[PDB]
Design an enzyme around this catalytic site. Structure first.
Site, PDB file in Angstrom:
ATOM      1  N   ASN A  43      42.937  45.860  44.488  1.00 63.35           N
ATOM      2  CA  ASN A  43      42.181  46.534  43.427  1.00 63.35           C
ATOM      3  C   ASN A  43      42.570  48.012  43.302  1.00 63.35           C
ATOM      4  O   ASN A  43      41.715  48.891  43.194  1.00 63.35           O
ATOM      5  CB  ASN A  43      40.671  46.378  43.631  1.00 63.35           C
ATOM      6  CG  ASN A  43      40.262  44.937  43.870  1.00 63.35           C
ATOM      7  OD1 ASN A  43      40.535  44.059  43.052  1.00 63.35           O
ATOM      8  ND2 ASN A  43      39.607  44.686  44.997  1.00 63.35           N
ATOM      9  N   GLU A  99      33.542  49.432  33.262  1.00 65.32           N
ATOM     10  CA  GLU A  99      33.003  50.670  33.812  1.00 65.32           C
ATOM     11  C   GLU A  99      33.563  51.830  33.003  1.00 65.32           C
ATOM     12  O   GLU A  99      34.571  51.697  32.304  1.00 65.32           O
ATOM     13  CB  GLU A  99      33.343  50.828  35.297  1.00 65.32           C
ATOM     14  CG  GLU A  99      32.392  51.738  36.062  1.00 65.32           C
ATOM     15  CD  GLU A  99      32.495  51.563  37.564  1.00 65.32           C
ATOM     16  OE1 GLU A  99      33.306  50.727  38.014  1.00 65.32           O
ATOM     17  OE2 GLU A  99      31.764  52.262  38.297  1.00 65.32           O
ATOM     18  N   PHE A 159      51.283  43.543  50.656  1.00 67.56           N
ATOM     19  CA  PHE A 159      51.620  44.216  49.399  1.00 67.56           C
ATOM     20  C   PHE A 159      51.501  45.732  49.532  1.00 67.56           C
ATOM     21  O   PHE A 159      50.966  46.417  48.658  1.00 67.56           O
ATOM     22  CB  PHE A 159      50.757  43.700  48.247  1.00 67.56           C
ATOM     23  CG  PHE A 159      51.055  42.284  47.855  1.00 67.56           C
ATOM     24  CD1 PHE A 159      52.210  41.975  47.156  1.00 67.56           C
ATOM     25  CD2 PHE A 159      50.181  41.261  48.182  1.00 67.56           C
ATOM     26  CE1 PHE A 159      52.490  40.674  46.793  1.00 67.56           C
ATOM     27  CE2 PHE A 159      50.456  39.956  47.820  1.00 67.56           C
ATOM     28  CZ  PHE A 159      51.612  39.663  47.125  1.00 67.56           C
ATOM     29  N   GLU A 186      27.024  38.490  39.069  1.00 68.42           N
ATOM     30  CA  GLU A 186      27.384  38.428  37.663  1.00 68.42           C
ATOM     31  C   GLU A 186      28.358  37.281  37.436  1.00 68.42           C
ATOM     32  O   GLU A 186      28.976  36.764  38.373  1.00 68.42           O
ATOM     33  CB  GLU A 186      27.990  39.752  37.186  1.00 68.42           C
ATOM     34  CG  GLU A 186      27.679  40.090  35.742  1.00 68.42           C
ATOM     35  CD  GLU A 186      26.279  40.645  35.562  1.00 68.42           C
ATOM     36  OE1 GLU A 186      25.686  41.105  36.561  1.00 68.42           O
ATOM     37  OE2 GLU A 186      25.776  40.629  34.420  1.00 68.42           O
ATOM     38  N   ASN A 234      34.628  55.877  33.693  1.00 66.45           N
ATOM     39  CA  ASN A 234      34.885  56.907  34.691  1.00 66.45           C
ATOM     40  C   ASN A 234      34.706  58.278  34.052  1.00 66.45           C
ATOM     41  O   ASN A 234      35.371  58.597  33.060  1.00 66.45           O
ATOM     42  CB  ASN A 234      36.288  56.765  35.278  1.00 66.45           C
ATOM     43  CG  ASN A 234      36.371  55.684  36.336  1.00 66.45           C
ATOM     44  OD1 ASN A 234      37.143  54.733  36.210  1.00 66.45           O
ATOM     45  ND2 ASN A 234      35.572  55.823  37.387  1.00 66.45           N
ATOM     46  N   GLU A 259      36.655  51.375  30.643  1.00 62.70           N
ATOM     47  CA  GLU A 259      37.471  50.238  31.046  1.00 62.70           C
ATOM     48  C   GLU A 259      36.860  48.931  30.560  1.00 62.70           C
ATOM     49  O   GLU A 259      35.644  48.731  30.640  1.00 62.70           O
ATOM     50  CB  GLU A 259      37.643  50.204  32.567  1.00 62.70           C
ATOM     51  CG  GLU A 259      38.243  51.478  33.140  1.00 62.70           C
ATOM     52  CD  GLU A 259      38.135  51.543  34.648  1.00 62.70           C
ATOM     53  OE1 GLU A 259      37.513  50.638  35.239  1.00 62.70           O
ATOM     54  OE2 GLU A 259      38.676  52.499  35.244  1.00 62.70           O
ATOM     55  N   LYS A 293      25.844  51.068  38.457  1.00 64.09           N
ATOM     56  CA  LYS A 293      26.166  50.060  37.453  1.00 64.09           C
ATOM     57  C   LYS A 293      24.940  49.622  36.662  1.00 64.09           C
ATOM     58  O   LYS A 293      25.073  49.212  35.506  1.00 64.09           O
ATOM     59  CB  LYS A 293      26.829  48.851  38.115  1.00 64.09           C
ATOM     60  CG  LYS A 293      28.349  48.884  38.081  1.00 64.09           C
ATOM     61  CD  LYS A 293      28.912  49.815  39.140  1.00 64.09           C
ATOM     62  CE  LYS A 293      28.754  49.225  40.530  1.00 64.09           C
ATOM     63  NZ  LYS A 293      29.435  50.051  41.565  1.00 64.09           N
TER      64      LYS A 293
HETATM   65  N1  ATP Z   1      33.227  41.072  36.237  1.00 64.83           N
HETATM   66  C1  ATP Z   1      34.491  41.059  36.675  1.00 64.83           C
HETATM   67  N2  ATP Z   1      35.246  39.966  36.426  1.00 64.83           N
HETATM   68  C2  ATP Z   1      36.509  39.945  36.859  1.00 64.83           C
HETATM   69  N3  ATP Z   1      37.177  40.882  37.535  1.00 64.83           N
HETATM   70  C3  ATP Z   1      36.407  41.950  37.770  1.00 64.83           C
HETATM   71  C4  ATP Z   1      35.088  42.120  37.382  1.00 64.83           C
HETATM   72  N4  ATP Z   1      34.608  43.353  37.799  1.00 64.83           N
HETATM   73  C5  ATP Z   1      35.634  43.892  38.413  1.00 64.83           C
HETATM   74  N5  ATP Z   1      36.753  43.101  38.433  1.00 64.83           N
HETATM   75  C6  ATP Z   1      38.045  43.416  39.033  1.00 64.83           C
HETATM   76  O1  ATP Z   1      37.861  44.460  39.976  1.00 64.83           O
HETATM   77  C7  ATP Z   1      38.651  45.610  39.604  1.00 64.83           C
HETATM   78  C8  ATP Z   1      37.900  46.872  39.941  1.00 64.83           C
HETATM   79  O2  ATP Z   1      37.248  47.350  38.746  1.00 64.83           O
HETATM   80  P1  ATP Z   1      36.520  48.749  38.713  1.00 64.83           P
HETATM   81  O3  ATP Z   1      37.226  49.692  37.823  1.00 64.83           O
HETATM   82  O4  ATP Z   1      35.046  48.515  38.381  1.00 64.83           O
HETATM   83  O5  ATP Z   1      36.588  49.229  40.226  1.00 64.83           O
HETATM   84  P2  ATP Z   1      36.393  50.597  41.017  1.00 64.83           P
HETATM   85  O6  ATP Z   1      37.666  51.089  41.578  1.00 64.83           O
HETATM   86  O7  ATP Z   1      35.256  50.386  42.018  1.00 64.83           O
HETATM   87  O8  ATP Z   1      35.841  51.552  39.871  1.00 64.83           O
HETATM   88  P3  ATP Z   1      36.213  52.922  39.137  1.00 64.83           P
HETATM   89  O9  ATP Z   1      37.739  52.888  39.007  1.00 64.83           O
HETATM   90  O10 ATP Z   1      35.589  52.795  37.743  1.00 64.83           O
HETATM   91  O11 ATP Z   1      35.704  54.088  39.916  1.00 64.83           O
HETATM   92  C9  ATP Z   1      38.954  45.413  38.124  1.00 64.83           C
HETATM   93  O12 ATP Z   1      40.153  46.083  37.753  1.00 64.83           O
HETATM   94  C10 ATP Z   1      39.097  43.894  38.026  1.00 64.83           C
HETATM   95  O13 ATP Z   1      40.394  43.467  38.426  1.00 64.83           O
HETATM   96 MG    MG Z   2      37.408  51.757  37.191  1.00 68.15          MG
END
Ligand code: ATP
Ligand code: MG
Ligand code: 1VU
Ligand code: BTN
Lengths: 673, 247, 261
Positions: free
Chosen positions: A241, A294, A354, A206, A296, A281, A122
């Site tokens: 998530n 992010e 869930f 953050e 991908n 995203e 990141k």
């Molecule tokens: N800064 C933020 N503020 C609020 N919610 C956040 C934040 N960062 C992440 N999230 C929440 O966490 C979830 C995960 O996001 P992200 O896509 O980065 O996860 P990941 O599965 O680790 O990554 P990727 O799918 O890119 O490999 C997001 O969809 C959102 O709901």
């Molecule tokens: Mg993602």
């Protein structure tokens, strides 16, 4: 699907599941020989039997089958593979895989190593976005190592705080902290979690944002520097998530915001030199303030929803740009041609957190391909089994239409005609979230599933009219079965004297309520009186088909009879939810009162296994007076770790959950006192 | 339930490697009409399943081995349980369908002292005496005299089928090799010869002991049609007041 | 890591191909059909259930133990089918495999079909084209013929037996058609004689060809052995389909009654 141009002659897919089937189908569209890899368990999968030739790559577990990279190169050099496709996950975004493939003459269909290195962590992605005029979530830049420094930084950046470990990701390592004491709490708990999981300990603090609607942009580029954005997708609805329901045309955004997002995304892709298909995203708040989340560098699981509104095949474009051909489309060609919503049917139990993943074979499996506007992407078939080694993935169900309402109607119809027998799915949860009032209106957010169901998913809360319809359908089914039971062949020695029952009086027990029902048959139409309310049920009354189409008061309904018993018990799928009813004759119901109930020795103090899996951690000992909320043990099951708690305070009598053991569902392991 | 309904879920129900077990009740549910099966003695002698079902609307008696319990071996309790049900079904003109997956009889001194021979003879008599049409499907294995006890073709059987994963052998491959090649001092090449020569349905199919090797997914449609042609089966036997069952 | 499924596959393919593709072509060039397409034309579409597909001979003398002399099915295709909705049991000799001459497995399959038919109570239709008995098989061929004769006599008057000679039947293969209720022949392609013309010339010193010794005309005109003669295989099969509707399925059933306008 023009085959005139020169194209690869042999492609080896390096992934399993429905994505493997999709890529194999796309390769077969262009007349390309396709090679597939599989473990020993997946030797009978649909994708291996659909591909030209299949190669074993080791034992069942992913570590020695789909993570044995040397096995992949050995298979490639055995099969004379020109190219390779990793799909998503596994080895899709591994730098070592990319460099090993580049060492040989084989070409890797996807982003180059530079993009993987840029987007791996990141910190680098955030700084690249900062230097490429990209808006990012505000906060400190760099790795924080001191708890006091972390809480101070939280003080400057703002009261809400989120901590996420650098790299890794995939739904883990993300924590929310509110106060400075809670900030340092999250700091050291996230440090411990990162050490346990990956050991990087590169957690980042953050500014957290509330109601972060999750939107994404599909970018497609080639080696010539041309890049395009494929409209957008909306994927806010999640649990733990992970997305389960997502829709390409985001109703929240408008034309100008969509154009701005597309231009910004293509600028970012040009800055990072992305020459493949990828996703970026964004977290849009209530005030349309976009923030980079992010990017991908791989194909997204929800790519079918955005490839139907645009009316194009994305895998063909991915293969063409892997070859090196220039893009044959421009930004003016990218247009919206309707609406598309699609859901992810999993092998989980929605009533537990869930969705608690479950295992088992598929006794019956039928998809609603004949329904209009339905597209199914599934890597399974009747007879397939769900193990504890792969993701509990069943299918992706996509529905396209002219607008949102008609597409949602098609989607609900698609769930109503989806037959799965053998495992526990989450069709009820998908039905509920797609028929929710706010979802139809549009007001949705990331925490939608959490706050709509504060106490967890409970099922469909059917109304009075729906309850009457369900009772009438169940009574009519019972009477139809009873009538069918009297149809023997002619004997000519003992003629059958059919009973003449004008009206059937029944006492239907549903939940904890008994309803008096009067049923009458006139040909194929049943007249049912439930507590004075009259209803008419018309159907062909085919008692063998898994799906039954009925008409109640002019309204069409689809019903699945999951189970029935001679004693009266009947489990029926109505509106995507399984209801258990007890249908008895009036005389039988009135005679049942004089009869004692059977004692059940399960009055709490019982800790069985909610799901089958391998125990990894034990936090109990015989004689421990643990209180409520204490984790009894930790169970790992097919890419999920669950630590069930205690519902009441008690002293453990015996512990049967010995460490490093596999336990099935319902395996009693602790009995507290 | 249509007579020609396919059952593709049974194409991989039997595990490819031998030591793993499966549920025969799943096969029985998949084959019969509407997946309805009235089980008789469901909690006694769990290594065998007997019950009533329907094929194309006609009632049939289902007898099968259970690889889950006791690895599908036969003992006293299972022999008696199968024999009584088979005798009743034959007496009241009910067709019999058999699913064979048995490695032999359960060994031990408790079985010998209990009279395992008498009860095995009871089951063999019950299957041999039956006059009603009999259909047999060999799922995985049928070793030794148990293969005869499970309504083989030579017990006046009407139709016998074998799945592609089946194998009919005199005894275990290792035991047969060690009892036949004692003087050859070879346990590697002879073992492979035996494994890829006689651990397969081909010796029986060549000998005609099975009418065909059928795909599992077509088993139901393969059975119902047979029950169409065997409804008029009639045989004659020498007159007797009653026979002497080995009870 | 077992190739048993693949072995099943090529065994099915070989059994369906019979004795070879070029031998099938040679057998077609003389205006004759193969046994499998013969059965497909005789029976109702999608109703043929075959039995004993993977059965071959036992002989280990005169070099028949070689892999080139192992034909699955072994010169006969046996099973059951339906004509106009009525059950029937059929066997068709395969002239490709060793000239169709009968061995232990061939007679075993025919006896199994006859036993099933007599147990159920259905007629038997036999399409005959065989050069006699496998000489290198031994006395097993005589045993097979005796079993066939015994089953034909036992079932006489119980179920109707129909024989259609569509090739050069000779030796002991001629007694079975004469032991059935009706015998039909195909013109200019089927022969029926106990002894061949060459032996007749060697013994009685006279010159006769096959056509005037055991042809369809000499058996439907002056010998009284056959009951009808047809132009070719297709016409013969269509006429046999027409003729089957007249007869009852068993002696326990009354005369068939069709719809009269
Ligand atoms: N800064 C933020 N503020 C609020 N919610 C956040 C934040 N960062 C992440 N999230 C929440 O966490 C979830 C995960 O996001 P992200 O896509 O980065 O996860 P990941 O599965 O680790 O990554 P990727 O799918 O890119 O490999 C997001 O969809 C959102 O709901
Ligand atoms: Mg993602
Ligand atoms: C009860 C006692 C008996 O059964 S006596 C059996 C008859 N005695 C014989 O010697 C067989 C002579 N008959 C034949 O050869 C043919 O069937 C006749 C009737 C001549 C047909 O004419 P034609 O078309 O020329 O035959 P063909 O040259 O194409 O021969 C084809 C293959 O058929 C074979 N065949 C035939 N009969 C047997 C038999 N009894 N035993 C073993 N094989 C037989 C032949 O071997 C011949 O083989 P090939 O394919 O030519 O190599
Ligand atoms: C494992 O066998 C299947 C991996 C599935 C990947 C899931 S789904 C999409 C998310 N993105 C990611 O990297 N892991 C998650």
């Amino acid at each position: 699907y023009d085959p005139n141009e020169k194209t690869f002659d042999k492609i080896l897919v390096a992934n399993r599941g429905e994505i493997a089937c999709r890529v194999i189908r796309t390769c077969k569209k262009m007349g390309i020989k396709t090679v597939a890899i599989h473990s020993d368990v997946d030797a009978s999968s649909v994708h291996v039997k659909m591909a030209d030739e299949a190669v074993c790559v080791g034992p069942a577990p992913t570590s020695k089958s789909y993570l044995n990279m040397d096995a992949i190169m050995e298979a490639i050099k055995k099969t004379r593979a020109q190219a390779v496709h990793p799909g998503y996950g596994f080895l899709s975004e591994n730098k070592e895989f990319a460099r090993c493939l580049a060492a040989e003459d084989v070409v890797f269909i996807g982003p180059d190593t530079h993009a993987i290195q840029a987007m791996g962590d990141k910190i680098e992605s955030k700084l690249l976005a900062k230097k490429a005029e990209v808006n990012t979530i505000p906060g400190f830049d760099g790795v924080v190592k001191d708890a006091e420094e972390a809480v101070r930084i939280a003080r400057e950046i703002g009261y809400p705080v989120m901590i996420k470990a650098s790299a890794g990701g995939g739904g883990k390592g993300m924590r929310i902290a509110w106060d400075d004491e809670e900030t340092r709490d999250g700091f050291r708990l996230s440090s411990q979690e990162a050490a346990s999981s990956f050991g990087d300990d590169r957690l980042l603090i953050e500014k957290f944002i509330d109601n972060p609607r999750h939107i994404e942009i599909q970018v497609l580029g080639d080696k010539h520097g041309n890049a395009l954005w494929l409209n957008e997708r909306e994927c806010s609805i999640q649990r733990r998530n992970q997305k389960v329901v997502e829709e390409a045309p985001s109703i929240f955004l408008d034309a100008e915001t969509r154009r701005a997002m597309g231009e910004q995304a293509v600028a970012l892709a040009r800055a990072v030199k992305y020459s493949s298909a990828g996703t970026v995203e964004f977290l849009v708040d209530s005030k349309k303030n976009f923030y980079f989340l992010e990017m991908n560098t791989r194909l997204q699981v929800e790519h079918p929803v955005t490839e139907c509104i645009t009316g194009l095949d994305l895998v063909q474009e991915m293969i063409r740009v892997a070859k090196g051909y220039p893009l044959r489309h421009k930004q003016a060609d990218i247009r919206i041609n309707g609406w598309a919503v699609e859901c992810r049917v999993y092998a989980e139990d929605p009533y537990k957190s869930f969705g608690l993943p479950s295992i088992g074979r598929l006794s019956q499996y039928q998809e609603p391909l004949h329904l209009p506007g339905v597209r199914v992407d599934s890597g399974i078939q009747p007879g397939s089994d769900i193990s504890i080694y792969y993701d509990p993935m069943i299918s992706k169900l996509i529905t396209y239409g002219s607008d949102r309402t008609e597409a949602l109607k098609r989607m609900a119809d698609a769930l109503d005609n989806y037959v799965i027998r053998g495992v526990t799915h989450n069709i009820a949860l998908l039905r509920e979230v797609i028929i929710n009032s706010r979802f139809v209106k549009g007001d949705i957010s990331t925490k939608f599933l959490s706050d709509v169901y504060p106490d967890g998913f409970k099922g469909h809360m059917l109304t009075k009219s729906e309850k009457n319809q369900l009772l009438a359908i169940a009574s009519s089914l019972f009477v139809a079965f009873q009538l069918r039971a009297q149809h023997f062949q002619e004997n000519s020695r003992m003629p059958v004297i059919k009973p003449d029952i004008a009206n059937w009086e029944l006492s239907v027990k549903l939940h904890d309520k008994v309803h008096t029902v009067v049923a009458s048959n006139n040909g194929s139409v049943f007249s049912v009186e439930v507590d004075g309310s009259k209803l008419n049920v018309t159907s062909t009354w085919n008692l063998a088909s898994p799906l039954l189409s009925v008409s109640v008061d002019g309204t069409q309904r689809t019903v699945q009879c999951l189970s029935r018993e001679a004693g009266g018990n009947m489990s029926i799928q109505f509106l995507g939810t399984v209801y258990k009813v007890n249908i008895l004759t009036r005389l039988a119901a009135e005679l049942n009162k004089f009869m004692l109930e059977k004692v059940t020795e399960d009055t709490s103090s019982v800790l069985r296994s909610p799901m089958p899996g391998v125990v990894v951690a034990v936090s109990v000992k015989p004689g421990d007076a643990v209180a409520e909320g204490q984790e009894i043990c930790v169970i790992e099951a097919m890419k999920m770790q669950n630590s069930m708690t205690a519902g009441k305070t008690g002293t453990v009598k015996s512990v049967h959950c010995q460490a490093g053991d596999t336990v099935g569902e319902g395996d009693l392991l602790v009995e507290l006192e | 339930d249509p007579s020609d309904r396919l059952v593709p879920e049974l194409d991989t129900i039997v595990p490819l490697e031998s030591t793993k077990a499966y549920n025969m009740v799943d096969i029985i549910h998949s084959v019969v009409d509407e997946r309805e099966f009235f089980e008789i003695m469901p909690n006694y002698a769990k290594n065998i399943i007997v019950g009533f079902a329907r094929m194309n609307g006609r009632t049939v008696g289902i007898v099968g081995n259970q690889p889950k319990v006791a690895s599908g071996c036969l003992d006293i309790n299972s022999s008696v349980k199968g024999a009584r049900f088979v005798r009743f079904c034959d007496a009241f003109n009910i067709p019999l369908i058999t699913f064979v997956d048995v490695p032999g009889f359960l060994p031990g001194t408790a079985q010998e002292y209990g009279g395992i021979i008498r009860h095995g003879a009871k089951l063999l008599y019950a299957f041999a005496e039956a006059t009603v049409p009999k259909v047999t499907v060999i799922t995985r294995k049928a070793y030794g005299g148990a293969y005869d006890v499970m309504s083989s073709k030579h017990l006046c059987g009407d139709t016998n089928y074998a799945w592609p994963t089946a194998e009919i052998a005199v005894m275990g491959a290792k035991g047969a090799v060690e009892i036949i090649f004692k003087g050859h001092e070879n346990v590697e090449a002879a073992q492979a010869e035996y494994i890829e020569k006689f651990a397969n349905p081909f010796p029986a199919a060549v000998r005609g002991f099975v009418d065909d090797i059928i795909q599992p997914s077509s088993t139901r449609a393969r059975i119902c049609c047979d029950l169409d042609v065997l409804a008029s089966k009639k045989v004659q036997r020498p007159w007797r007041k009653h026979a002497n069952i080995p009870l | 890591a077992t190739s048993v499924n693949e072995r099943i596959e090529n065994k099915r393919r070989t059994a369906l191909l019979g004795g070879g593709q070029r031998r099938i072509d040679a057998q077609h060039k003389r205006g004759k059909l193969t046994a499998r397409e013969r059965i497909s034309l005789l029976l109702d579409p999608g109703s043929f259930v075959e039995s004993d597909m993977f059965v071959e001979h036992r002989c280990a003398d005169f070099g028949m133990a070689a892999d080139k002399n192992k034909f699955p099915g072994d010169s006969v295709v046996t099973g059951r089918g339906r004509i106009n909705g009525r059950l029937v049991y059929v066997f068709s000799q395969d002239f490709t495999v060793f000239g169709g001459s009968l061995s232990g497995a061939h007679a075993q399959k025919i006896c199994k079909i006859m036993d099933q038919a007599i147990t159920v109570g259905a007629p038997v239709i036999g399409l005959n084209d065989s050069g006699g008995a496998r000489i290198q098989e031994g006395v097993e061929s005589l045993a097979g013929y005796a079993d066939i004769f015994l089953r034909n006599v036992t079932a006489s008057g119980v179920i109707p037996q129909i024989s259609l000679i569509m090739g050069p039947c000779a030796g002991g293969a001629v007694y079975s058609p004469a032991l059935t209720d009706f015998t039909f022949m195909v013109k200019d392609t089927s022969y029926l004689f106990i002894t061949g013309p060459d032996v007749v010339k060697s013994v009685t010193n006279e010159d006769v060809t096959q056509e005037e010794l055991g042809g369809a005309k000499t058996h439907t005109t002056m010998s009284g052995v056959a009951h009808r003669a047809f132009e070719n295989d297709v016409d013969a099969l269509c006429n046999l389909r027409d003729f089957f509707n007249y007869l009852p399925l068993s002696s326990q059933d009354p005369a068939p009654v069709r719809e009269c306008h």
